[PDB]
Amino acid sequence: EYRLPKGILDKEIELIEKMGVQIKTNMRLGVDISLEYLRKNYDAVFLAVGAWKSSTLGCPGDSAEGVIGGIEFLRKVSMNQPVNLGQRVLVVGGGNTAMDAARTAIRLGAKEVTVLYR
Amino acid sequence: EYRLPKGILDKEIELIEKMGVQIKTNMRLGVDISLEYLRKNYDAVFLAVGAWKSSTLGCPGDSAEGVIGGIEFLRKVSMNQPVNLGQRVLVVGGGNTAMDAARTAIRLGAKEVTVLYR
């Protein structure tokens, strides 16, 4: 939110909806909606699902409690869901996800946050 | 159609739709739509799927071509889909399905139709 406030995003999406676009939220492909349904009742289908599966650490013990994916952590923070942070946080990576997670952890009350890049 | 014309049925269903009921046709549970979607987006779900799987003959060779289920044959006839009859037609059963299939076959040009009841 400190880089892109969500009110601006809401206003832009409302402008898009004002053009006649019907946005059905909470609808998931493969869970709520099958691809056959869309292919049958729609002339064209455009998939913009995006990369929504954070990579695992790839080292033994990556499934231990207290290790969370970057985008999942940021989604929990944005949704105001309770996350289990702590005094010490290490972020593994060097992309936008790592820096956003580090700064969010700093703003979420972590005493020290350290980013590890290879 | 000779027992229940479909125009009357269409008129009654149109009367029902005039009350505010939204009938989404060509939507199938488990194929086009999911039970979880209904349970999430709707307060109550009422299932009236009916018995839509005709029983197989239960004898060897029941899968040979030229053996067709009663309700499937009647659905093909009602939908005006091309069905493969012949001069000789046998009907196995004694319910409404068997009698309707026999009379439809008689009206579809079968020279002789015989109903076999145990």
DSSP string of A37-49, one letter each residue: HHHHH-S------
CB crowding B56-69: b at 16 or more within 10 Å, else e: eeeeeeeeeeeeeb
Triad A42, A44, A49: Cα angle to 5°: 100
A31/B31 CB distance under 8 A: no
Who's near A117: CB < 8 A, 6+ residues apart?
A93, A94, A98
B88 bridge partner residues: B112
Query: According to the annotation, is B3 in a ligand binding site?
Result: yes
Method: cryo-EM
One-letter amino acid of A4: L
Q: What are the C-alpha distances in Å from A81 to residues A5, A72, A84, B57?
A: 18, 11, 10, 57
Q: For residues B111 and B9, what is the distance between their CA atoms, to the nearest angstrom?
A: 31
B31/A36 CB distance under 8 A: yes
- Residue B102: CB atoms within 10 A of its CB come to 19
Which tokens belong to A26? 């909470």
Q: For residues B81 and B74, what is the distance between their CA atoms, to the nearest angstrom?
A: 10
Q: For residues A15 and A21, what is the distance between their CA atoms, to the nearest angstrom?
A: 10
Q: For residues A97 and A76, what is the distance between their CA atoms, to the nearest angstrom?
A: 14
Integer Rg of chain B from CA: 18
32-71 in chain B: CB under 8 A from chain A: 32-34, 36-37, 40-41
* Residues B52 and B71: beta-carbon distance below 8 Å: yes
Closest CA to A45 of A63, A68, A29, A61: A29
Report resolution in angstroms: 3.0
Specify the DSSP class assigned to residue A55. Answer: P
Which tokens belong to B100? 């309707």
Dihedral sign from CA coordinates of B61, B64, B66, B71: positive
* Residues on chain A touching B25 (C-beta within 8 angstroms): none
Ordered DSSP codes for chain B: --SS-HHHHHHHHHHHHTTT----TT--BTTTB-HHHHHHH-S----------PPP--STTTTSTT---HHHHHHHHHTT------SEEEEE--SHHHHHHHHHHHHTT-SEEEEE--
